[PDB]
Design a protein around this ligand. Structure first.
Ligand SMILES: Cc1cc2nc3c(=O)[nH]c(=O)nc-3n(C[C@H](O)[C@H](O)[C@H](O)COP(=O)(O)OP(=O)(O)OC[C@H]3O[C@@H](n4cnc5c(N)ncnc54)[C@H](O)[C@@H]3O)c2cc1C
Ligand SMILES: Cc1cc2nc3c(=O)[nH]c(=O)nc-3n(C[C@H](O)[C@H](O)[C@H](O)COP(=O)(O)OP(=O)(O)OC[C@H]3O[C@@H](n4cnc5c(N)ncnc54)[C@H](O)[C@@H]3O)c2cc1C
Lengths: 379, 198
């Protein structure tokens, strides 16, 4: 779009930072040992990356949405898993707190995760309920002084590392999408148990498991906002989260393209250099124009959020198009690298694997199309 | 006599009859009928036959008879399965189901929740990631009922469920369902089991 001069500065910061602290030596050790170095997380919160869009009014940083996408992009370019550790407190953890949470709840819960002392998991998906989150089966019962819950959540990012977790349970089983409340549960409590860490294809460095709840009692003082609003709470958090996912889509894209034209300048075949064969140079072009076209898609969505108009469609388009053409790009970059791009030492293969979930999680591309078409045809 | 039996692996019943054949004979399956009344001590007319053996008029000659106790049995080969999930709480629950499986003559299976908890090994797991089973009976004991499990036993000839919460999906394919804690329901099932004679 047009970047406000402070946001250009922030771009400079996140660039030099992500480039300097995420070295090849480290990231390889992260893939081998699926553990991100706590020292780096602390280092990030110390300069505020854990608090980008939360304002100074609550002890945040006072940036705009465009600053969250900028840091998301410039980080994700260099490493995917870093982005995962970045979006959680900015969007997925700090979201529902920011909407339906009293000042006390925010005092005891949000400032820890902005400063990197506590970790919060956003836990919504169940084995029976994926795209159809409305068909949940986790229950929440009112006992007066506390709530009693019994259910099971799959695919919960960061959960074994998290101290508290926002869990969506069904209170009024008849009302369905209208009868879901949101609660904050301390994971160290009773009944709470974790499943195995799931062996995923990429984005290795952040654990992801099940949250199992067996007659876990939760106090009333830890409920999100009004009762049965929770679903709209989770949706309206999911919109900015989807902006996040498109942001990392656009990030890893820029990276894999940069490796693309770099390798294509340096490698020579048949006497010419790679980049002087018309097929390649055109291919580079194609990837570049799409990437830009859609960078513009997503920048625009975030700017809308910053000027307060509803961005629910625009973000959905951004996530959809961004993630899909990200995958196309990542693959083509493998193909330019040729054989060498299939060995793990060449960064392009780690990207190619990372960017694959991008079209599934945070709402699939299908859910995106359902939202978008459903938004355009109502008359 | 109208003789009926199952053929084609049990998919086509047929009433085969012998019109030009006297006598009419038929091997009959064990368990289909039931016992008659015992000790009216009506009568008897014990009749004699000859037993007139020959000088090698029986070429089959027996060296040894063996009675084995077959304890190894694969979850894929079994005819009766007692499967247990996270509704056991403790790893020791399988003893109960082991008691159940023994009166029937089959093995114990597991769901992923227990394997990833450490209560069993992956050889036992059933579902899309596990292994598919088509027993003659399946016991769905304390399993939520994710499709990740229901996928690998949908064609069990009859599925019996034992769960605490009635809002468990498993009751969608349960041929017979019982709501409760299995640690109480399971032993009572074995009680009435032997009480009729297996
Ligand atoms: C698992 C595996 C097993 C292998 N086994 C064998 C084996 O048994 N024997 C063997 O000999 N090799 C083997 N190879 C190597 C493989 O055959 C070669 O890599 C392949 O022939 C292409 O060579 P390259 O990867 O170096 O391509 P490069 O030429 O180094 O890469 C050039 C890239 O640009 C493109 N390009 C190349 N030339 C042109 C041009 N003139 N105009 C336009 N675009 C162009 C290509 O599509 C490619 O993407 C194996 C590779 C792998 C990954
Ligand atoms: C990639 C992947 C692959 C998977 N593959 C499989 C697979 O092949 N097979 C599989 O089974 N799962 C698989 N799963 C996991 C599956 O989705 C469920 O997590 C699993 O089925 C949960 O265990 P459970 O079925 O025993 O139900 P759980 O929810 O773990 O069991 C709780 C149920 O037992 C009841 N209960 C609790 N206590 C008692 C009691 N004392 N008496 C009676 N009932 C009680 C509860 O009310 C509830 O109904 C997979 C998951 C992933 C991510």
């Amino acid at each position: 779009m047009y970047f406000s001069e402070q946001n250009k500065m922030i771009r400079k910061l996140a660039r030099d930072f992500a480039e300097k602290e995420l070295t090849t030596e480290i990231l390889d050790e992260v893939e081998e040992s699926g553990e991100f170095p706590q020292e780096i997380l602390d280092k990030m919160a110390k300069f505020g990356f854990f608090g980008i869009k939360i304002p100074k009014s609550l002890g945040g940083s006072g940036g705009d949405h465009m600053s969250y996408v900028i840091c998301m992009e410039e980080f994700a370019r260099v490493s995917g898993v870093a982005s995962v550790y970045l979006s959680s407190p900015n969007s997925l953890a700090g979201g529902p707190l920011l909407l339906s949470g009293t000042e006390e709840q925010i005092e005891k819960y949000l400032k820890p995760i902005i400063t990197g002392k506590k970790k919060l998991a956003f836990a919504l998906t169940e084995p029976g309920a994926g795209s159809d989150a409305g068909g949940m089966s986790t229950t929440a019962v009112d006992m007066g002084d506390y709530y009693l819950l019994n259910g099971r959540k799959t695919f919960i990012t960061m959960a074994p590392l998290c101290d508290d977790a926002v869990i969506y349970a069904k209170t009024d089983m008849s009302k369905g999408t209208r009868g879901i409340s949101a609660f904050i549960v301390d994971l160290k409590s009773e009944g709470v148990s974790m499943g195995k860490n799931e062996h995923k294809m990429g984005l290795i460095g952040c654990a992801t498991s099940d949250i199992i709840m067996e007659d876990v009692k939760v106090p009333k003082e830890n409920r999100l906002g009004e009762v049965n609003k929770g679903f709209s709470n989770a949706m309206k958090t999911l919109d900015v989260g989807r902006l996040g996912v498109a942001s990392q889509s656009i990030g890893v894209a820029q990276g894999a393209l940069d490796e693309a034209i770099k390798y294509a300048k340096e490698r020579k075949q048949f006497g010419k250099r790679i980049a002087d064969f018309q097929a390649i140079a055109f291919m580079i072009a194609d990837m570049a124009t799409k990437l830009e076209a859609a960078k513009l898609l997503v920048y625009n969505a975030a700017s809308l959020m910053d000027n307060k108009k509803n961005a629910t469609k625009e973000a959905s388009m951004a996530k959809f198009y961004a993630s899909e053409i990200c995958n196309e790009i990542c693959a083509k970059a493998v193909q330019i690298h040729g054989g060498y791009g299939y060995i793990k030492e060449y960064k392009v293969e780690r990207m190619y694997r990372d960017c694959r979930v991008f079209t599934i999680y945070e709402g699939t591309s299908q859910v995106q199309q359902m939202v978008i078409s459903g938004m355009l045809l109502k008359k | 006599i109208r003789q009926t039996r199952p053929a084609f692996g049990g998919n086509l019943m047929a009433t085969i009859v012998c019109p030009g054949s006297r006598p009419q004979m038929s091997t009959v399956r064990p368990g289909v009928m039931d016992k008659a009344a015992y000790d009216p001590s009506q009568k008897g007319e014990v009749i004699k036959l000859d037993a007139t053996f020959n000088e090698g008029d029986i070429r089959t000659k027996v060296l040894e008879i063996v009675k084995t106790t077959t304890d190894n049995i694969s979850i894929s080969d079994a005819d009766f399965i007692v499967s247990g999930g996270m509704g056991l709480g403790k790893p020791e629950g399988f003893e109960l189901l082991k008691q159940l499986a023994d009166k029937l003559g089959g093995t114990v299976a597991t769901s992923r929740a227990c394997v990833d908890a450490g209560w069993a090994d992956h050889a036992q797991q059933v579902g899309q990631t596990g292994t598919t089973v088509k027993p003659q009976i399946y016991f769905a004991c304390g399993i939520s009922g994710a499709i990740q499990h229901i996928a690998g036993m949908q064609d069990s000839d009859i599925i019996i469920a034992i769960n605490k919460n009635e809002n468990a999906p498993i009751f969608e394919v349960a041929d017979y369902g019982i709501v409760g804690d299995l640690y109480k329901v399971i032993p009572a099932i074995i009680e009435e089991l032997d009480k009729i004679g297996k």
